[PDB]
Design a binder for this molecule. Structure first.
Ligand SMILES: O=P(O)(O)O[C@@H]1[C@H](O)[C@H](O)[C@@H](OP(=O)(O)O)[C@H](OP(=O)(O)O)[C@H]1O
Length: 119
């Protein structure tokens, strides 16, 4: 795995994805799976951000959905194809991340890659 898995190799490099929050709010955010295959670094532009706030554990993930499988994606990303969007659902209070991949290969890597680590 990891070194031999093409999805995980892609995630270790990181990707520029678009985070969907509303009709207007759709902004670029860089995500990158860390070498320990345990955490993900995420770009943030929050008023009071911090290095620890920009990491989240794979252990906090319930599932990763492909396609328009969330309200936010069903309402705000109609213009985006089914194969270029996905969502990361969390176990705790962390809000679900609705994401748009620059290409189907990217969405594939994230969904498949995270599913491999979660299971
Ligand atoms: O609306 P503003 O003032 O632009 O600020 C963003 C807004 O609060 C988003 O809801 C938030 O995403 P989450 O809901 O996922 O926190 C994003 O965080 P981010 O910068 O960490 O993506 C903020 O920057």
């Amino acid at each position: 795995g990891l070194q031999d898995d093409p999805d995980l190799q892609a995630l270790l490099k990181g990707s520029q994805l678009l985070k969907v929050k509303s009709s207007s709010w759709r902004r670029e955010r860089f995500y990158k799976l860390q070498e320990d295959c345990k955490t993900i670094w995420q770009e943030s532009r929050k008023v009071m951000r911090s290095p620890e706030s920009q990491l989240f554990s794979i252990e906090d993930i319930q599932e990763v959905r492909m396609g328009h499988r969330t309200e936010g994606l069903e309402k705000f990303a109609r213009d985006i194809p089914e194969d270029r969007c996905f969502s990361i659902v969390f176990k705790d209070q962390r809000n679900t991340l609705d994401l748009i991949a620059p290409s189907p290969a990217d969405a594939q890597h994230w969904v498949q890659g995270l599913r491999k680590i979660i299971h």
